[PDB]
Amino acid sequence: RGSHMIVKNGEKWMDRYEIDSLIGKGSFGQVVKAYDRVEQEWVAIKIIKNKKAFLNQAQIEVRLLELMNKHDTEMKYYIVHLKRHFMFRNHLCLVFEMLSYNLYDLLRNTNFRGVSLNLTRKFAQQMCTALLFLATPELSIIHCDLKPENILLCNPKRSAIKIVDFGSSCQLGQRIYQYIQSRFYRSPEVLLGMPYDLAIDMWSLGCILVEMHTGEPLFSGANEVDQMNKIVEVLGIPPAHILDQAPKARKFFEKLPDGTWNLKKTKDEYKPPGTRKLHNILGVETGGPGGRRAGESGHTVADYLKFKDLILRMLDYDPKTRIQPYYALQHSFFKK
Ligand SMILES: Cc1nc2ccc(-c3cc(N)nc(N)c3)nc2n1CCOc1ccccn1
Numbered sequence: 001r002g003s004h005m006i007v008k009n010g011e012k013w014m015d016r017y018e019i020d021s022l023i024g025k026g027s028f029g030q031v032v033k034a035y036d037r038v039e040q041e042w043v044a045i046k047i048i049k050n051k052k053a054f055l056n057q058a059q060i061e062v063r064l065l066e067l068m069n070k071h072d073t074e075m076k077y078y079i080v081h082l083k084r085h086f087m088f089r090n091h092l093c094l095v096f097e098m099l100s101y102n103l104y105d106l107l108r109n110t111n112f113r114g115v116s117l118n119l120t121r122k123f124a125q126q127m128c129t130a131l132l133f134l135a136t137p138e139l140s141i142i143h144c145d146l147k148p149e150n151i152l153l154c155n156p157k158r159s160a161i162k163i164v165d166f167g168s169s170c171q172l173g174q175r176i177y178q179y180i181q182s183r184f185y186r187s188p189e190v191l192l193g194m195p196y197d198l199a200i201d202m203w204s205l206g207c208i209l210v211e212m213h214t215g216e217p218l219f220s221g222a223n224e225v226d227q228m229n230k231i232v233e234v235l236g237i238p239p240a241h242i243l244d245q246a247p248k249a250r251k252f253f254e255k256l257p258d259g260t261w262n263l264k265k266t267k268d269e270y271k272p273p274g275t276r277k278l279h280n281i282l283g284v285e286t287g288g289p290g291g292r293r294a295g296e297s298g299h300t301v302a303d304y305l306k307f308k309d310l311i312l313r314m315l316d317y318d319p320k321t322r323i324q325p326y327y328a329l330q331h332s333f334f335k336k
Contacts, residue, residue, distance in 0.1 A: 003029075003049035003050050003051045003054075004029060004030060004047075004049060005029070005030065005047045005050075005088075005089055005091045007019055007022065007030065007032055007047070009021055012037070013034070013088060014088070015037070016036060016037050016038050017034040017035070017036060017037070017043070017045065018034055018035040018037060019032050019033075019034045020032075020033040020034055020035060020042075021033050023044060024044070024046075026165070026167075027054070028046065028048055028049065028054050028057065028058065028165075028167050029046065029047045029048045029049040029054060029091070030046075030047045031044050031045065031046050031047070032044070032045045032047060033098065036095075041098075042098035043083060043095050043096065043097070043098055044095075044096045044097070044098050044099065045093050045094070045095055045096070046058075046093070046094040046096065047091050047093055048091055048092040048093070048094070049091070050090050050091055054167075055092055057167040057168065058092050058094065058167060059092070060166070060167070060169065060170075061094070061165075061166040061167050061169070062082070062085050062092075062094065064139075064141055064166045064169055064171075065079070065080075065082040065166060066082070067139060067141075068133070068139065068141070069081075069082065071133075071136070071139075073133065073136075075129055075130070075132060075133035076133055077162075078126055078127075078129055078130035078133060078161070078162055078163060079130060079133065079162060079163055080096050080097065080099065080152070080162045080163065080164045081096065081097045082094060082095070082096060083095040083096065083097065096164075099152040099153065099154055099162060099164070100152060100153040100154060100155055100156045101152070101153060101156065102148060102149045102150070102151060102152050102153075103123070103148035103149075103151045103152075103153075103161070103208070103212060104147075104148040104149050106148075106153070107148065107211070107212065107215055110215060111215075112215035112216060113215045113289070113290070113292055114212065114213045114214050114215035114289055114292075115212055115213065116213075116293075116296075116298060116299075117213060117288075117293070117298050117299055117303055117304070117307060118298045119159060119212075120209055120212050120213045120307070121307075121333060121334065122159040123151070123159070123161055123209065123212060124205075124209050124310070124333070124334070125329070125334055126159075126160070126161050127151070127161070127163075127205050127208070127209075128205070128325050128328040128329050129325070129329065130163050131198070131201055131202060131205065131325040131328075132325035132326060132329065134198065134201070135198050135324070135325055135326075139171075140171050140172035140198065141166070141169055141170075141171060141198075142169060142170050142171070142172065142174075142196070142197070142198055142200060142201060143163065143166065143168075143169050143201050143204075144168045144169055144170060144177075144180045144181060144200065144201075145165055145167070145168040145169070145180075145181065145182060146163070146181075146182075146185055146201050146204035146205060146208060147182040147184070147185050147204070147208070148208060148211065148212070150163060150164050150165045151163060151164075151208070152164055168180060172197055172198065173197075180196070180200075181200060181204060182204075183221050183223075183224070183227055184207060184211075184217045184218075184219055184220055184221065184227070185203075185204035185207050185208065186204075186227060187199070187200040187203035187204070187319070188203070188228070188231060188238060188242070188317055189242075189319050191224060191227060191228050191231075191248065191251075191252070192238075192242070192243070192246035192247065192248050192249060192252075193246065193247035193248040194242075194245065194246055194247065196319075197319060198324075199319035199320075199322045199324075200319070202314050202322055202323065202324070202325070202328070203314065203315060203322065205314055206218075206311050206314030206315040207219060207315075209307075209311060209314075210278070210281065210282070210311055213282070213288075213289060213307070214281065214282070214289040215289065218234070218281070219231050219234070224251070225251065225252060225266065228251075228252040229252075229263070229266075229270045230270075232263060232270070232273050232274075233270050233271045233272075233273070233274075233275065233276040234274070234276045234277070234278055234281070234315075235274065235315060235317060236273045236274030237253070237261050237262065237263070237273050237274075238253075238261070238317045239317055239318060240259065240260065240261055242317060242318065243255075243261045249261075250264070251264075252264060278308055278311060278312060278315075279308060282304055282307065282308050282311075283304075284301060284304040284305060284308055285301055285304075287299075288304065306331070306332050306333040307333055309331075309332075309333070310323070310328065310331045310333045313328070313331070314328070
């Protein structure tokens, strides 16, 4: 009764898994911490709900994780490792390496004042390497759900991170789900109902990295129209050649007689298009977010200008010219 598996702390599965406790949850089902008695090690077991839509999503996840594990490259280690999968009490069970807390928990630890530019840079470099791996031709995987909750520290003391949750993922050219990406991290092409490729993940990364340094979401929309309005506050009206091709352009925008585009007024205010400058959100010249980094080492105007320049390349409206992972890794923000 119910789609979830019932789990009692202390119980043992197939004389092997000491279900320690419950460490996670989602629309997919539950994640449990269990000791693998046979392998003398902690594992995270993702227990998929007994519902066809979530079972179908998890079989795509198993297939893409096994595709990735076939690759001889050190880059694959920014992706969470699937150890095994089996059916148990009519639930699909995915056994993962045990990781530490997600990047939202890390922000909550700072009272949402943000982590340092130095740590932000370390997360940025690993995430760009993970996106480079996903962009390998034979993979061409779109994650489609990048958010701080889906980026996990390997260890609570170190900077090493891994991407989890390929449940909403697809490969280049697929259209499977009605709505994709977590709203705050959703690319303009997805809001506009346009075709989407690996560039949507780069957009999400841009939003994530600003949130990690400032402590608060760059674009916190309560709905799709509010999301697009928040993006326009910072980046201005999207290019006419994009909006001219966009199925949902008229959800947000209106074409003038002279051929130019403006915001549709809401059925009711926002800052004028492009007036909420990322320069001021980052506090490039005013001591960083809320002035809290003033004088601190690793928070110079020069460091901030490189960060801002890389972020604005990740948040390019045009998915064709948006910076790609290979080029992102060559940016002066990452220079030793
Ligand atoms: C502590 C820990 N280790 C994990 C290893 C893997 C996974 C894991 C792996 C895959 N493919 N999808 C999910 N959804 C979680 N989740 C782990 N968690 C804690 C739980 O985090 C989260 C994060 C996001 C959503 C739910 N729960």
